[PDB]
Design a binder for this molecule. Structure first.
Ligand SMILES: CC1(C)[C@@H](O[C@H]2O[C@H](C(=O)O)[C@@H](O)[C@H](O)[C@H]2O)CC[C@]2(C)[C@H]3C(=O)C=C4[C@@H]5C[C@@](C)(C(=O)O)CC[C@]5(C)CC[C@@]4(C)[C@]3(C)CC[C@@H]12
Lengths: 583, 582
């Protein structure tokens, strides 16, 4: 269902706060959810739990953890229908109402919920336990594999992606109410004919006794159009288009109306009128060529892990405007819905990506004992959920299906082939892409032709022709010449960068140094501007972020242009100079 | 005497190395130079001793220390005269040969020596003890005062300058030989008539029996002119000039010649043909206007303190060339002589400066109980020794008499007046300056008219309390207007910058961030470029350096554009942008 909001017809209670917290264990208490949890530990919920507690055992935990609290359903909600919703449980969430399992969800970055109307009476209190599991298998979306250290028996988690496997309730939890007859879903699609804007809409509602009205209201509160029925086409004269760098949002009120013209349900959906098209080598937004500038990001801050944070969100966006970035990519998982809403209002463009990173063991990655058909089922599910959630965001301009898959290997094409089609079939308003790793050159990649736009991640300066910038220039150039001569598509660079410790400086060519970072980004730009087919450049990464432990990671990933606490490295000023002095 | 060298007639022995080291104490060994020091400590000799031992007592020590080692005079110096020289002992040095005092010297940054010819015989070993004192008084030229912490009894050294009071033998020590008849000094003075270069020379030699010859050899080895006599004028047709862009150096060989045609003594002095001139607000090198770019520096590196270091010197000059900096000032004491030679070869320009910093207690600074005429003598003495040693360097383009005196107070003009006259008199070929502090505004200062070029130190602190850039800008411009209306002289900004920790970053305007330092330098430049009379900009400082302890000092002074270990802050790149262009 739609992201819940408070209306004249719907109530919404935040369940964020401190919750009682416990790890699972091998105790005579298998089944925590059946009674009041016994812990002195409280974990705040919009948070990953790993770094909260300054305890190694919680942090390194593999398997289930339990959050618990008492909740009271408002007495004035009799005659209504109500649900508990998790915006996200990373990676596998279960919801329990007093000992009853009521939901079981498997991906780590999308919503789920349970209708508890008939299980708990209005004005009743109940014990809400949400179990969350972090275990990654070859069938989970980021895939991974649990192993056991030989000498100690410590359970340990392997995976093939960078960012740390933060787990828990990294996004908000909610109790909300909906009327018996309610709106369940809305799809809006937006074209333009000359200066007239056209909204294709479809409303899905629980019942049909009494009907659907729609109103489109501009930023001034003026109703600009109306329509009747659960689906149709709304004409808007002299539309205020939604543009990169100049958002405009209309406000689409779907109501349910009874036999009298009395309102039964209402829901307010923000929509931007905008078109995306790929014509040969150009990426077009409202029939105007567009060039991405900005970053791959991560949901990651000093203590709350992947926990959504309003201050860092508003600030991060403020830093984007400051340096003239116009976009970012939801690198390696869908971000919080509230970030997409904020991008819509800020006029920021978004490459929206599924959690499907780490489909690469470089042993054959696409075989029965690795990424296999059941894995592809999970991947298809992730695509559906993401698209289902973010279909109405004008900011979201393209779906990224995966990140660094081993798209050079036998079996990779048979694995991915259905996936671009599924996305295009669920949402025909946007192009589909994926982010290509260096192994999969223009020669070796065997997947690229099934996508509408090509995204490349490349580290010539850092990882291969190390500190040898001229050597990296030549190989970068060759490569790009290969892609441009082989495909007639837009090419957006989505990773390029270098680990850089703030404060570390050198007059020489010195990796990890602030000067080196600048020298490399600067060179990459020089090469980009030589190629007409480039449609975007997004630096890796916006900010330093935590990764799994490893001798080649200095307390995480330091390829940020800002520090974890958002202080600018020299590179940040270079991009600022570049992106504000060119379109 | 002249900086010693190896010639065909002269031998030179380095005495650098590890020496035995002891602090003074109050036991019956009241005279350590009268016998072998049995201490187990060894201190390296081109170095300050303070951070070397990882020991508090030694670092914080106030008073004398003793260095010691044996030396052997070579067998073949029989017919020869021989000396022990310290390039520098900071601040007060004594040389002992086996229980006998043979030299006592007071300034901390210039050389001294002793003729030991008659005390020790060729082929003899002797015990060399060198006592060095670190105490400052109101009469030492950087002045200070020793005090006692009442609760602990601890002896403590107060002073008014920034940089830490490092002591010891910060510079090399030598045993050397010279014939009985020898050259003792040479003065060269260079000038231009059309395209022909002129060299006035004067040679001072220990005896006048048998004459003096001079040859002037070019960079290709060609003798290009000669002269006879102890003094004269040599003409160099179509001279290649020494320029800031591009050093060219002639090599002048002064000799003493016996009745026959036989060389008895010889000495090789590098000379660059160049003029310096002030005209109105313009500083002219070889008749064309010059704009100083670069730094205030310090002799400061991580362990050895003020000890001279060939590596850091070459690198520091590469970094200057890297950022297109064309000059620096020897803030705030003469630097190693080798730096001045190296500056000559590198084509870099030098404001050469005395130890006279800290003549300011902001109680009346210039008065009989504070900085007085006895102090002025040490100061005159300091000018004398600096000019005598650096007079022949083409890189040295101006003398700086003092840094941050209280030039706004009563007594200040009467104290200073003799000093620039003295400098111009010992060297009439260069202009004289001093670095003026923020208190001495164009109104308040009462000394400035006695100098040829005005050097201002104007940290933004003087102008704004709360690190507000627009406030700083309005006040700097007002002040510079005052100076340009009231004096017809070149103005060089000799201190400007911001304390800055490497790695501290902010998208806001925040002091102590790399961004703030950048923005402040940049705003200062915009202001300087609005004024025709500006002849120069030297940022304070080149690199981070150690200071006395202050809660306002973060393990030293962090105004460096480089870190102590020579890493660039963002400010270095900003300066590189400006100086490599215009
Ligand atoms: C690590 C990834 C998947 C890729 O994405 C990463 O970006 C950042 C990072 O590298 O730290 C982080 O955001 C995070 O860790 C990841 O998202 C970056 C590129 C990547 C490291 C590849 C390379 O950089 C280069 C490789 C070369 C190329 C190869 C095969 C060739 O084509 O000739 C020669 C050998 C080698 C080392 C093979 C591995 C890759 C393709 C590598 C390391 C794979 C992983 C990539």
């Amino acid at each position: 269902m739609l992201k819940p909001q408070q209306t004249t017809t719907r109530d919404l209670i935040s369940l964020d706060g401190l919750w009682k917290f416990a790890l699972a264990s091998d105790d005579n208490n298998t089944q925590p959810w059946t009674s009041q949890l016994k812990t002195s530990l409280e974990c705040p919920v919009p948070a990953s739990y790993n770094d909260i507690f300054a305890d190694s055992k919680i942090h390194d935990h593999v398997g289930w953890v339990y959050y618990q609290r008492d909740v009271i359903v408002p007495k004035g909600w009799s005659e209504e229908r109500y649900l508990v919703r998790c915006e996200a449980a990373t990676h596998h969430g279960r919801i329990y109402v007093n000992g009853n399992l009521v939901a079981d969800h498997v991906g780590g970055y999308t919503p789920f919920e349970a209708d508890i109307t008939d299980l708990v009476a209005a004005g009743e209190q109940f014990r809400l336990t949400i179990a969350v599991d972090n275990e990654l298998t070859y069938q989970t979306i980021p895939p991974g594999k649990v192993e056991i250290l030989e000498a100690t028996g410590k359970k340990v988690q392997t995976y093939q992606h960078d960012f740390y496997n933060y787990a828990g309730l990294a996004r908000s939890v909610w109790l909300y109410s909906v009327p018996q007859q309610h709106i369940q879903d809305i799809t809006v699609r937006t074209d333009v004919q000359g200066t007239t804007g056209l909204i294709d809409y479809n409303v899905v509602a629980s019942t049909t006794q009494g009907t659907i009205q729609v109103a489109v209201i501009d930023e001034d509160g003026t109703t600009v159009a109306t329509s009747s029925g659960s689906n149709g086409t709304i004409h808007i004269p002299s539309v205020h288009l939604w543009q990169p760098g100049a958002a405009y949002l209309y406000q689409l009120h779907a109501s349910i109306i009874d036999s009298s013209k009395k309102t039964i349900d209402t829901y307010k959906l923000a929509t931007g009128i905008r078109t995306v098209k790929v014509q040969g080598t150009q990426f077009l937004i409202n029939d105007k060529p567009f060039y991405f500038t900005g970053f791959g990001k991560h949901e990651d801050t000093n203590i709350r892990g992947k926990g959504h944070d309003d201050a860092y969100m508003v600030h991060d966006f403020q830093l984007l405007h400051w340096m003239g970035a116009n976009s970012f990519r939801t690198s390696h998982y869908p971000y919080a819905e509230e970030v997409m809403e904020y991008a819509d209002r800020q006029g920021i463009v978004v490459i929206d990506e599924t959690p499907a990173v780490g489909l690469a063991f470089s042993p054959a990655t696409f075989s029965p004992d690795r990424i296999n058909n059941k894995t592809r089922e999970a991947h298809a599910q992730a695509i559906r959920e993401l698209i289902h959630r973010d279909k109405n965001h004008p900011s979201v301009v393209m779906w990224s299906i995966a990140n660094d898959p081993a798209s050079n290997e036998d079996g990779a094409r048979e694995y991915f082939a259905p996936l671009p089609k599924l996305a295009r079939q669920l949402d025909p308003t946007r192009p589909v892409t994926f982010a290509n790793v260096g192994l999969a050159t223009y020669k070796a990649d065997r997947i690229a032709d099934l996508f509408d736009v090509l995204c490349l991640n490349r580290y010539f300066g850092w990882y291969t022709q190390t500190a040898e910038l001229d050597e990296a220039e030549a190989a970068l150039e060759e490569e790009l010449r290969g892609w441009t001569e082989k495909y007639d598509k837009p090419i957006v660079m989505t990773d390029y960068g270098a680990d850089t410790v703030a404060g570390l400086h050198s007059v020489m060519v010195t990796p990890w140094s602030e000067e080196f970072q600048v020298e490399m980004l600067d060179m990459y730009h020089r090469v980009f501007d030589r190629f007409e087919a480039m449609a975007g450049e997004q630096v890796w990464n916006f900010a330093d972020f935590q990764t799994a432990v490893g001798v080649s990671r200095v307390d995480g990933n330091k390829k940020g242009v800002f520090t974890r606490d958002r202080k600018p490295k020299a590179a940040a000023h270079l991009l600022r100079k570049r992106w504000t002095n060119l379109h």
